[PDB]
Each structure stands twice: as structure tokens, then as C-alpha cells.
Design a protein around this ligand. Structure first.
Ligand SMILES: *[C@@H]1O[C@H](CO)[C@@H](O[C@@H]2O[C@H](CO)[C@@H](O[C@@H]3O[C@H](CO)[C@@H](O)[C@H](O)[C@@H]3O)[C@H](O)[C@H]2NC(C)=O)[C@H](O)[C@H]1NC(C)=O
Ligand SMILES: *[C@@H]1O[C@H](CO)[C@@H](O[C@@H]2O[C@H](CO)[C@@H](O)[C@H](O)[C@H]2NC(C)=O)[C@H](O)[C@H]1NC(C)=O
Lengths: 158, 417, 79
């Protein structure tokens, strides 16, 4: 299969030829991935234009608009995680007090996805009985439902 | 050409001050003549016409922010005295001289982040008195978040405000000296901003954008009015300096085109002070001299501020060197008064011939009032007591973490005076 | 004969020198001086950061060079 690739040709349109005589789809060219091992696909790549729901990093890389202030610095230059206090947030996400966005589903779930743990401390007890931990878990001052086994378990997760 | 001694215009009172470089500091119009004079704290080296002016004080030093160190070099003593170390990615520096009237002075430098690690803007006490590592230096982060690349920085001593620029943010953000309230006074129409200077006397801030559109702006210190002084043949205009002593003239360096020029405060009279400076990166003017760094070889070059004479090499620091700032009392005239009358709730920015209230970013004035904003009032934050051991004394912290001095035999006192 | 690796990932070392039980090398990328146990034990320890212009590290000490070694030359050769 790999013997005659030098003689093998590529499709005239919608195909990119690499220095390894490798034919790859034109879409895969300049995708940020070495589809062909010689990196001919990514050798010369002007950054693409970001779409309507894509934020453009200072690295000229497009990331999903949901990832601005993602609290995980998805873009390499970390330009996504800036001005989070002035960014408001998307309608389907809850904004931490630090200003970062988090899924509204992950609010009051016992998991402090927000670094400041505001996603869990802003809600009452998970049950009116008077406690936040349903499964006999450990509730720290941040109301995080650290598992009962995980209670005082090595590093201070909360 | 003709015997028309009085052809409409004749020989009469000539404002020689209009001519460039007529006098180093202050020229006064005289009938068919001029009156060249220095200013307060400046004495004449020579005759009154074109009198050179000498600073009546301690020898000037050149703060040199290398990548990992910020060392001060005494021009007269021709020696390097270390001030800061163990830090990284230091880009721009500026100082406020004596904020609290003590011997030391606060120096505001910038740290640029790499990768995930964000940068920050930090301040610490530089002693005006000669002192190397004998006095421990405590850097204090202003805790400004989202600092990507603080390329330039300037200090508003009159307004007690720090003006800095970020290339990545493309925002010239201003904040209080401790960073209590931070505002985006321009944050628009900027592509790769660069070193910024502020003139409290004229109430004007000046910055450059070495980006695709090489421009030098002269917006108000509160940002209400914005205009472009020059936009032609600017290449990469990184580095800026204001000659407050002499007509508040503006000087800039073109890294890309390798030329250093100057313009008036309104940008009318454009002249070339010197050419072929081997890619200057920063400037600063003291007395009658201008210093610049050829970042390529990390060398300091001096020449007459009016373009006369020849460039002279003085020092060769590591290639890392990024800026040259002339550390002296008279460099930043502190006589200018403060027009702010503690009317604004959080921030009182300056403007030409006046003061205007502003609000921290993300907040607005309360309805019906232009003095009170909606944000809360943050408590003032001050630096810890600094090491003050004057003549080589080594400072040690007591059980109370209070800086005390191991005063040498040469002197005496609490601070080895 | 006996080839051993004292340390790995020294960040592009450029020069060496050994004194007592320690070996110093220069990471010429950012001009940092690193020290580690000469037998490969322990961990590398940063000591100094000078200009990238730094090109060598030389340990300046009396015992670094054994001046005791006698001279076998007996002023026989002309030059
Ligand atoms: C640097 O600071 C000194 C003060 O420490 C400045 O002295 C100033 O000198 C100007 C004149 O050149 C003063 O303006 C006028 O002075 C005359 C008397 O000569 C007076 O009759 C006028 O009413 C007016 O005050 C100015 O007031 C004074 N500065 C003060 C007191 O704030 C010096 O000029 C400065 N050098 C510069 C900026 O070049
Ligand atoms: C730079 O070095 C000079 C020379 O040491 C300092 O000036 C001297 O300061 C001492 C102490 O006040 C005086 O006794 C000398 O008469 C001064 N002489 C000269 C030639 O200036 C100068 O103060 C230093 N720079 C500073 C501290 O800003």
C-alpha cells in the first residue's frame, strides 16, 4: 500500500499533497494537526477567520465563544481568561464571583467548579433537614460535599 | 536683496525662543534678541546665552530594567549598584520620587507574563541614597489581574495615578497608585500600544502604537479628548519622553526605521534629532542630553538633546536591557499642584486646565451626580516599612518583622545617618 | 570505558567545571548557572542568572589545579 505513493497522485480539488507524497483532504490542511508526518499540512498556515460564535485569541487562534473565561485557559496565550468581571456571561452559564463562567447545571451540585466555590455556597441546604451532604459526606465551610471517604483525605481539596 | 529696510516686515523684536534649540531650558523673547535662563535647581555652567544647566543635587542615576534585574547606575560614580533581582520578565520602569517624604522612593516596574502565567505590575522602594543589596527590597504586587504584556508605564505624581499600556490587551488602563480602582480610559482604536508618558502640567498623556498604524497620540489625561499628533513615516515608534523643562516637547524613537525625532506638544514642528541609532528602544532626557538603548547590543548612547554634537557610547548592559530611565529629582518636576479637591468618590483623573471625576471600570456614576460612582470604596493600601540603612548598613527584620539596621562603624543613628 | 549520565535535561549546557563534590554548568539559552552533585546524586540547583552573553563557567580556586605535579622538562629542548 505504501510502496507506490511517489507514483500515486492526489485528487485535483479538495486534496492537499504533502512532501511525503501523502494526499490528505484540503479541509485537514492547516487544521493545527499533522495529518501527514512531514508537517507539510501545517508548514505554512495563515490563521483562519473566526466564525460568529468563535472568540479570536491574541494568538490568532479561534476558540468557541463559550470558552472565554472558561477557567481552564483553553487558548495557549491565556487571552481568553481576561476581563471576566466585565464580560457578564452567556445566558446558559452561571458566573462565579471571580467573574468566570460555569455551567448552570454544575451550580449547587456539590462540586465547586468555580475556584471561589461560589457555584455551591450561594444555595441553601440540599435538603430541608439541615445539611448539605446527602450521602453522609463532609461539608466544609465552602459547603462542598467532599465524599465521606474523602473527608480529611490527604490534600485539602476544599 | 533690496534697500527695503521696512518692507512691511522689518528688523524688530524677534522671538528667538521660536527657533529650535535656542536655549536649553527657558528662553525669553527680547527685542531682536533673546534671554536664555535655566530653572529652579539648575545653575548655569556658562554665559547667559545658551547657558548649560546643571542639576543642583545628587548625581543622576540610570535605572536599567534588565530581564531579571533592575540595577541603578550612578552616572558620575560610573558604577553599577544592584537594587532588585530574582525576578523575571521585567519590561518597563518608572518612579514617583519621594511619595512619603522619606529618603527612599517608590519605583513602579512591569512584569510580562508567559504562557498561562499572567503578568503583573509591581512596586517597591528604591533608596535615593547609595545602597546596594545591603538593604533588602520587598516587591509588592499591585494585584492587577489580566495583565498580559505591560510594555510601558508612566507615573502621574500630581494625580497619584499610574498609567500603563498592554500590547495584548490593546488598552491603556489607568489605576490608583496602589491599584484600588482601575479604568480603561482609551481601550479603543489601538493596535499594539507602546511606551506612554504623562504631562500633569498640560494635562495630556502621550503614547505610541508601533502596530500596523504607527501613531503618536496626545489624548487628555482623563481620555475625554483624543487626537493623533503624527502618523507619517513612524515605523515602530517604541519609546517616548517629554522634555518638561523645555516647552514640554515630545521625543520619540523609531525602532524600525532607526531614527530618533521630536515634535511639539501639538505635533506641529517635527524635527530629526539624530539618525542611525542602531534601533533605539527607549529614550529619556535630562539637562541637555538624551539617552537611548540599542536593544540589539544593549548599549547606552548619549547626544545633545537639540540634535547637536555626536552620539556617544556610555554603557553596555546585557542584551536583555529593555528601557533607560533617568532617576533624578528634577527629572519629574513635583511643583505642579493638584486640582483634585477630593470630590470624586474613587478616581480623580486630570485634564487640561482642570480635573474631571471618573469611575472604576465596571461601575458608573450614581444617577443625578457626577461625583459619586456605584462601586464600593476600597481601603487604601500602603507599602510595608522599607529598609533605610543609608551608608552600607545591612537591614534585618526584628521579631516584630520591623526593618532594623546593622549600622556600621562609619556612621550612627536609627538609619545609620 | 565507564560511561555514565550524571544529569539529564540540563537545559542545553555549554560549559562545565568541577570543584569538591559539585559540577557547575551554563544553560546558554538564558545564562543560568546550575549545580548538582558530581556523582549524579541529588538534584540540579540554580545558582545565578547572568546575561545570555555568558559563554563559560570556570571555578577559580587554588586546589582546582594541582600545581604540585613536578615538571619533567629539564630545559633540554631549545624552544
Ligand atoms: C520645576 O519646579 C520649579 C519649582 O520647584 C519651577 O519653578 C517655577 O518657575 C516658574 C517660572 O519659570 C514659576 O512661574 C512664575 O514665576 C514668577 C516669578 O519668577 C511668578 O511671578 C509667576 O506668578 C509664576 O509663579 C512657577 O510658579 C515655579 N513653580 C512653582 C512655584 O510651582 C520650575 O520652573 C520647574 N521647571 C520646569 C517645569 O521647567
Ligand atoms: C554618585 O557618586 C558620587 C561620588 O561618590 C556622589 O557624590 C558625593 O557624595 C558624597 C556624600 O554626600 C559627598 O561627600 C561628595 O562630595 C560627593 N561628590 C561628588 C563628586 O558628587 C553622588 O552623591 C552619587 N550619586 C547619588 C547618591 O545620587
Amino acid at each position: 500500500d505504501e510502496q507506490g505513493c511517489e507514483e500515486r497522485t492526489c485528487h485535483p480539488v479538495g486534496d492537499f499533497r504533502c512532501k511525503n507524497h501523502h494526499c490528505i483532504p484540503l479541509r485537514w490542511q492547516c487544521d493545527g494537526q499533522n495529518d501527514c508526518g512531514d508537517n507539510s499540512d501545517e508548514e505554512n498556515c495563515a490563521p483562519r477567520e473566526c466564525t460568529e460564535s468563535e472568540f479570536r485569541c491574541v494568538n490568532q487562534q479561534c476558540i468557541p465563544s463559550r470558552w472565554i473565561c472558561d477557567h481552564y485557559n483553553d487558548c495557549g496565550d491565556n487571552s481568553d481568561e481576561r476581563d471576566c468581571e466585565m464580560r457578564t456571561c452567556h445566558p446558559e452559564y452561571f458566573q462565579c464571583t471571580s467573574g468566570h463562567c460555569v455551567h448552570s447545571e454544575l451550580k449547587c451540585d456539590g462540586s465547586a467548579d468555580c475556584l471561589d466555590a461560589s457555584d455551591e455556597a450561594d444555595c441553601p441546604t440540599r435538603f430541608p433537614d439541615g445539611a448539605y451532604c446527602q450521602a453522609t459526606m463532609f461539608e466544609c465551610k465552602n459547603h462542598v460535599c467532599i465524599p465521606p471517604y474523602w473527608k480529611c483525605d490527604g490534600d485539602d481539596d476544599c | 536683496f533690496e534697500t527695503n529696510v521696512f518692507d512691511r516686515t522689518s528688523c524688530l523684536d524677534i522671538n528667538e525662543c521660536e527657533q529650535f534649540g535656542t536655549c536649553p531650558q527657558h528662553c525669553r523673547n527680547t527685542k531682536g534678541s533673546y534671554e536664555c535662563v535655566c530653572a529652579d535647581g539648575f545653575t548655569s555652567m556658562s554665559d547667559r546665552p545658551g547657558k548649560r544647566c546643571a542639576a543642583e543635587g545628587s548625581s543622576p542615576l540610570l535605572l536599567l530594567p534588565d530581564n531579571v534585574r533592575i540595577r541603578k547606575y550612578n552616572l558620575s560614580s560610573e558604577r553599577f549598584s544592584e537594587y532588585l533581582q530574582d525576578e523575571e520578565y521585567i519590561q518597563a520602569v518608572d518612579y514617583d520620587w519621594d511619595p512619603k517624604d522619606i529618603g527612599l522612593s517608590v519605583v513602579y516596574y512591569t512584569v510580562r507574563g508567559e504562557g498561562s502565567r499572567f503578568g503583573a505590575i509591581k512596586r517597591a522602594y528604591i533608596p535615593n541614597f547609595e545602597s546596594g543589596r545591603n538593604n533588602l527590597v520587598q516587591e509588592v504586587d499591585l494585584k492587577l489581574k489580566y495583565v498580559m504584556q505591560p510594555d510601558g508605564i508612566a507615573v502621574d505624581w500630581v494625580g497619584r495615578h499610574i498609567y500603563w499600556s498592554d500590547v495584548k490587551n490593546k488598552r491603556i488602563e489607568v489605576a490608583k497608585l496602589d491599584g484600588r480602582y482601575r479604568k480603561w480610559l482609551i481601550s479603543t482604536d489601538l493596535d499594539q500600544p507602546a511606551a506612554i508618558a504623562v504631562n500633569p502640567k498640560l494635562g495630556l498623556m502621550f503614547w505610541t502604537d508601533w502596530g500596523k498604524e504607527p501613531k503618536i497620540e496626545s489624548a487628555w489625561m482623563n481620555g475625554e479628548d483624543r487626537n493623533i499628533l503624527v502618523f507619517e513615516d513612524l515605523g515602530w515608534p517604541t519609546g517616548l519622553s517629554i522634555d518638561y523643562l523645555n516647552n514640554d516637547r515630545i521625543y520619540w524613537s523609531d525602532f524600525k526605521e532607526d531614527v530618533i525625532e521630536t515634535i511639539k506638544y501639538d505635533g506641529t514642528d517635527r524635527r530629526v534629532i539624530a539618525k542611525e541609532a542602531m534601533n533605539p528602544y527607549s529614550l529619556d532626557i535630562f539637562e541637555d542630553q538624551l539617552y537611548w538603548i540599542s536593544k540589539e547590543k544593549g548599549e547606552v548612547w548619549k547626544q545633545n538633546k537639540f540634535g547637536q554634537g555626536k552620539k556617544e557610547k556610555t554603557l553596555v548592559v546585557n542584551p536583555w536591557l529593555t528601557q533607560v530611565r533617568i532617576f533624578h529629582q528634577l527629572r519629574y518636576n513635583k511643583s505642579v499642584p493638584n486640582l483634585c479637591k477630593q470630590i470624586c468618590s474613587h478616581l480623580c483623573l486630570l485634564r487640561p486646565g482642570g480635573y474631571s471625576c471618573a469611575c472604576p471600570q465596571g461601575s458608573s456614576f450614581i444617577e443625578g451626580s457626577t461625583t459619586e460612582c456605584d462601586a464600593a470604596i476600597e481601603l487604601p493600601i500602603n507599602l510595608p516599612p522599607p529598609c533605610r540603612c543609608m551608608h552600607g548598613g545591612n537591614c534585618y527584620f526584628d521579631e516584630t518583622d520591623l526593618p532594623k539596621c546593622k549600622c556600621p562603624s562609619g556612621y550612627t543613628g536609627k538609619y545609620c545617618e
